[PDB]
Amino acid sequence: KLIIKAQLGEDIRRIPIHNEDITYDELVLMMQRVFRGKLLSNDEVTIKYKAERGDLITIFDSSDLSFAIQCSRILKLTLFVNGQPRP
């Protein structure tokens, strides 16, 4: 359904999400689980996402998260005309 691909430094975790009404606080908890050995219980986790055209945008709460998820569903196509990308 939905894949969350999360990066902390060089470590990348790929998490499949089924309930799409996931809350911000649930997402934080999930990040804490998947990055178990990288974090202390008292670390403060900040979450950003790659927006359309690669700029990071901070997610502060569940409504930011929901919008970020809706903005996720992009299919990026490149078209070729008679085999040429630049006719």
Tab-separated table of N, CA and C in Angstrom:
chain	number	residue	atom	x	y	z
A	1	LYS	N	0.837	-1.236	0.000
A	1	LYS	CA	0.000	0.000	0.000
A	1	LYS	C	0.863	1.273	0.000
A	2	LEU	N	1.383	1.668	1.158
A	2	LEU	CA	2.282	2.804	1.255
A	2	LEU	C	3.649	2.336	1.800
A	3	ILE	N	4.726	2.783	1.172
A	3	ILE	CA	6.046	2.495	1.689
A	3	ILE	C	6.631	3.767	2.261
A	4	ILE	N	7.090	3.708	3.501
A	4	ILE	CA	7.884	4.802	4.057
A	4	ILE	C	9.340	4.408	4.010
A	5	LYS	N	10.142	5.206	3.323
A	5	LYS	CA	11.567	4.993	3.225
A	5	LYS	C	12.248	6.068	4.073
A	6	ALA	N	12.803	5.667	5.205
A	6	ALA	CA	13.349	6.635	6.185
A	6	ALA	C	14.865	6.535	6.270
A	7	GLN	N	15.519	7.690	6.300
A	7	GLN	CA	16.952	7.784	6.357
A	7	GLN	C	17.397	8.554	7.582
A	8	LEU	N	18.267	7.927	8.375
A	8	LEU	CA	18.962	8.581	9.480
A	8	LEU	C	20.475	8.412	9.249
A	9	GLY	N	21.150	9.517	8.929
A	9	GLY	CA	22.532	9.467	8.429
A	9	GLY	C	22.618	8.560	7.212
A	10	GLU	N	23.460	7.533	7.264
A	10	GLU	CA	23.586	6.615	6.122
A	10	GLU	C	22.611	5.441	6.171
A	11	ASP	N	21.945	5.241	7.303
A	11	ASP	CA	21.079	4.084	7.494
A	11	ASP	C	19.704	4.370	6.919
A	12	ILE	N	19.224	3.465	6.078
A	12	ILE	CA	17.918	3.629	5.449
A	12	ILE	C	17.052	2.440	5.852
A	13	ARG	N	15.822	2.704	6.278
A	13	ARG	CA	14.884	1.654	6.632
A	13	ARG	C	13.669	1.833	5.747
A	14	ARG	N	13.108	0.722	5.317
A	14	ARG	CA	12.003	0.725	4.398
A	14	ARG	C	10.854	0.063	5.133
A	15	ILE	N	9.812	0.832	5.450
A	15	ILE	CA	8.713	0.376	6.281
A	15	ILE	C	7.425	0.403	5.468
A	16	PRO	N	6.728	-0.727	5.388
A	16	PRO	CA	5.405	-0.749	4.777
A	16	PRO	C	4.308	-0.376	5.758
A	17	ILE	N	3.455	0.561	5.349
A	17	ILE	CA	2.395	1.104	6.185
A	17	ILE	C	1.058	0.712	5.567
A	18	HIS	N	0.168	0.223	6.417
A	18	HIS	CA	-1.117	-0.271	5.973
A	18	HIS	C	-2.239	0.691	6.372
A	19	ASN	N	-2.273	1.098	7.638
A	19	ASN	CA	-3.214	2.129	8.074
A	19	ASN	C	-2.701	3.498	7.617
A	20	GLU	N	-3.442	4.129	6.717
A	20	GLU	CA	-3.013	5.397	6.131
A	20	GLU	C	-3.347	6.595	7.021
A	21	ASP	N	-4.179	6.383	8.043
A	21	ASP	CA	-4.494	7.439	9.016
A	21	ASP	C	-3.477	7.475	10.175
A	22	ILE	N	-2.307	6.882	9.950
A	22	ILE	CA	-1.174	6.999	10.868
A	22	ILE	C	-1.022	8.417	11.409
A	23	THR	N	-0.812	8.537	12.714
A	23	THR	CA	-0.615	9.828	13.341
A	23	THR	C	0.877	10.177	13.389
A	24	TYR	N	1.176	11.452	13.544
A	24	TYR	CA	2.558	11.891	13.709
A	24	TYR	C	3.239	11.173	14.867
A	25	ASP	N	2.554	11.074	16.004
A	25	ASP	CA	3.167	10.454	17.171
A	25	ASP	C	3.412	8.965	16.950
A	26	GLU	N	2.484	8.279	16.291
A	26	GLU	CA	2.734	6.891	15.844
A	26	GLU	C	3.938	6.759	14.925
A	27	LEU	N	4.097	7.683	13.982
A	27	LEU	CA	5.252	7.655	13.100
A	27	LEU	C	6.562	7.839	13.866
A	28	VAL	N	6.587	8.761	14.820
A	28	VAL	CA	7.742	8.928	15.653
A	28	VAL	C	8.072	7.609	16.347
A	29	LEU	N	7.065	6.939	16.897
A	29	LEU	CA	7.299	5.705	17.611
A	29	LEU	C	7.869	4.671	16.674
A	30	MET	N	7.337	4.602	15.468
A	30	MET	CA	7.809	3.636	14.503
A	30	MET	C	9.280	3.885	14.143
A	31	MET	N	9.648	5.150	14.016
A	31	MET	CA	11.027	5.514	13.676
A	31	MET	C	11.923	5.084	14.816
A	32	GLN	N	11.460	5.279	16.042
A	32	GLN	CA	12.226	4.841	17.210
A	32	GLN	C	12.448	3.329	17.253
A	33	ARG	N	11.452	2.575	16.822
A	33	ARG	CA	11.587	1.130	16.743
A	33	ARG	C	12.567	0.736	15.642
A	34	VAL	N	12.389	1.271	14.435
A	34	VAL	CA	13.181	0.774	13.313
A	34	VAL	C	14.646	1.221	13.417
A	35	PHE	N	14.894	2.341	14.096
A	35	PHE	CA	16.250	2.865	14.309
A	35	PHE	C	16.695	2.601	15.757
A	36	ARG	N	16.284	1.448	16.284
A	36	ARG	CA	16.496	1.053	17.692
A	36	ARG	C	17.878	1.477	18.243
A	37	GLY	N	18.922	0.948	17.620
A	37	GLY	CA	20.281	1.106	18.135
A	37	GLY	C	20.985	2.402	17.775
A	38	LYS	N	20.267	3.330	17.168
A	38	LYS	CA	20.852	4.600	16.766
A	38	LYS	C	20.426	5.735	17.701
A	39	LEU	N	19.502	5.458	18.608
A	39	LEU	CA	18.844	6.505	19.374
A	39	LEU	C	18.859	6.199	20.846
A	40	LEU	N	18.820	7.272	21.623
A	40	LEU	CA	18.622	7.188	23.041
A	40	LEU	C	17.186	7.586	23.257
A	41	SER	N	16.588	7.060	24.321
A	41	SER	CA	15.189	7.332	24.647
A	41	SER	C	14.897	8.832	24.730
A	42	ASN	N	15.888	9.615	25.157
A	42	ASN	CA	15.742	11.070	25.268
A	42	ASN	C	16.140	11.884	24.023
A	43	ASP	N	16.548	11.244	22.935
A	43	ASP	CA	16.797	11.991	21.699
A	43	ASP	C	15.490	12.598	21.190
A	44	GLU	N	15.599	13.770	20.589
A	44	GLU	CA	14.474	14.418	19.970
A	44	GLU	C	14.601	14.191	18.489
A	45	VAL	N	13.600	13.527	17.928
A	45	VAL	CA	13.566	13.209	16.508
A	45	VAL	C	12.762	14.274	15.755
A	46	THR	N	13.390	14.826	14.724
A	46	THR	CA	12.771	15.738	13.772
A	46	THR	C	12.570	14.976	12.449
A	47	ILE	N	11.404	15.122	11.832
A	47	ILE	CA	11.083	14.390	10.609
A	47	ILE	C	10.824	15.380	9.496
A	48	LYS	N	11.551	15.202	8.407
A	48	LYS	CA	11.328	15.931	7.173
A	48	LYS	C	11.067	14.981	5.998
A	49	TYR	N	10.400	15.480	4.968
A	49	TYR	CA	10.165	14.694	3.762
A	49	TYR	C	10.583	15.425	2.506
A	50	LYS	N	10.953	14.620	1.519
A	50	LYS	CA	11.367	15.102	0.221
A	50	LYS	C	10.122	15.454	-0.547
A	51	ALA	N	9.950	16.745	-0.771
A	51	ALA	CA	8.832	17.230	-1.539
A	51	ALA	C	9.107	17.066	-3.035
A	52	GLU	N	8.092	17.393	-3.828
A	52	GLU	CA	8.203	17.370	-5.282
A	52	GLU	C	9.385	18.267	-5.652
A	53	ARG	N	10.309	17.719	-6.436
A	53	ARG	CA	11.582	18.380	-6.764
A	53	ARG	C	12.487	18.535	-5.517
A	54	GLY	N	12.661	17.422	-4.803
A	54	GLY	CA	13.799	17.190	-3.903
A	54	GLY	C	14.123	18.086	-2.716
A	55	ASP	N	13.249	19.021	-2.364
A	55	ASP	CA	13.497	19.897	-1.199
A	55	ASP	C	12.858	19.282	0.058
A	56	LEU	N	13.551	19.361	1.189
A	56	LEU	CA	13.041	18.759	2.423
A	56	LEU	C	12.084	19.708	3.111
A	57	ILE	N	10.935	19.177	3.517
A	57	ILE	CA	9.919	19.946	4.233
A	57	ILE	C	9.638	19.284	5.580
A	58	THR	N	9.626	20.058	6.663
A	58	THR	CA	9.428	19.508	8.004
A	58	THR	C	7.970	19.082	8.214
A	59	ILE	N	7.789	17.935	8.848
A	59	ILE	CA	6.482	17.451	9.230
A	59	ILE	C	6.361	17.679	10.729
A	60	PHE	N	5.414	18.513	11.173
A	60	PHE	CA	5.301	18.834	12.596
A	60	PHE	C	4.193	18.065	13.282
A	61	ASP	N	3.152	17.665	12.552
A	61	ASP	CA	1.979	17.047	13.169
A	61	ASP	C	1.256	16.168	12.184
A	62	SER	N	0.141	15.570	12.607
A	62	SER	CA	-0.572	14.600	11.784
A	62	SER	C	-1.156	15.164	10.477
A	63	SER	N	-1.658	16.398	10.511
A	63	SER	CA	-2.174	17.015	9.292
A	63	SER	C	-1.050	17.263	8.277
A	64	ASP	N	0.147	17.651	8.747
A	64	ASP	CA	1.311	17.749	7.843
A	64	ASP	C	1.635	16.381	7.240
A	65	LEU	N	1.546	15.356	8.084
A	65	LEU	CA	1.855	13.984	7.662
A	65	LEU	C	0.874	13.481	6.629
A	66	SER	N	-0.415	13.654	6.902
A	66	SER	CA	-1.446	13.279	5.959
A	66	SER	C	-1.255	13.934	4.584
A	67	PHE	N	-0.980	15.234	4.556
A	67	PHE	CA	-0.743	15.943	3.284
A	67	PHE	C	0.502	15.412	2.575
A	68	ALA	N	1.555	15.141	3.346
A	68	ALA	CA	2.785	14.628	2.823
A	68	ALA	C	2.532	13.278	2.161
A	69	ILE	N	1.719	12.443	2.799
A	69	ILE	CA	1.351	11.158	2.242
A	69	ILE	C	0.532	11.334	0.948
A	70	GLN	N	-0.405	12.269	0.915
A	70	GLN	CA	-1.175	12.472	-0.311
A	70	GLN	C	-0.289	12.993	-1.432
A	71	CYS	N	0.626	13.884	-1.096
A	71	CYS	CA	1.628	14.349	-2.055
A	71	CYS	C	2.626	13.268	-2.478
A	72	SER	N	2.550	12.067	-1.881
A	72	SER	CA	3.505	10.986	-2.191
A	72	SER	C	3.177	10.345	-3.541
A	73	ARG	N	1.878	10.170	-3.809
A	73	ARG	CA	1.397	9.420	-4.951
A	73	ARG	C	1.640	10.219	-6.227
A	74	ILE	N	2.877	10.176	-6.703
A	74	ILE	CA	3.281	10.803	-7.967
A	74	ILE	C	3.892	9.724	-8.848
A	75	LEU	N	3.380	9.583	-10.065
A	75	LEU	CA	4.034	8.699	-11.012
A	75	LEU	C	4.755	9.609	-12.005
A	76	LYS	N	6.080	9.514	-12.040
A	76	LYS	CA	6.938	10.351	-12.872
A	76	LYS	C	7.310	9.616	-14.139
A	77	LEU	N	6.792	10.091	-15.254
A	77	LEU	CA	7.010	9.413	-16.518
A	77	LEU	C	7.909	10.248	-17.401
A	78	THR	N	8.722	9.571	-18.199
A	78	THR	CA	9.383	10.234	-19.287
A	78	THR	C	8.967	9.562	-20.588
A	79	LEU	N	8.635	10.395	-21.558
A	79	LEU	CA	8.100	9.944	-22.815
A	79	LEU	C	9.162	10.015	-23.895
A	80	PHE	N	9.117	9.039	-24.796
A	80	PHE	CA	10.009	8.969	-25.952
A	80	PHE	C	9.170	8.922	-27.215
A	81	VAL	N	9.565	9.704	-28.213
A	81	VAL	CA	8.845	9.747	-29.486
A	81	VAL	C	9.726	9.048	-30.511
A	82	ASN	N	9.207	7.959	-31.085
A	82	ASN	CA	9.974	7.149	-32.018
A	82	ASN	C	11.371	6.890	-31.438
A	83	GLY	N	11.412	6.514	-30.157
A	83	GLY	CA	12.664	6.242	-29.447
A	83	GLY	C	13.493	7.426	-28.974
A	84	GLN	N	13.060	8.644	-29.281
A	84	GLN	CA	13.824	9.838	-28.933
A	84	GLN	C	13.193	10.565	-27.739
A	85	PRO	N	14.010	10.879	-26.706
A	85	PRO	CA	13.534	11.657	-25.555
A	85	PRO	C	13.391	13.147	-25.845
A	86	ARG	N	14.114	13.631	-26.859
A	86	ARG	CA	14.175	15.068	-27.159
A	86	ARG	C	13.960	15.320	-28.662
A	87	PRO	N	12.771	14.948	-29.182
A	87	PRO	CA	12.439	15.119	-30.605
A	87	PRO	C	12.286	16.601	-31.050
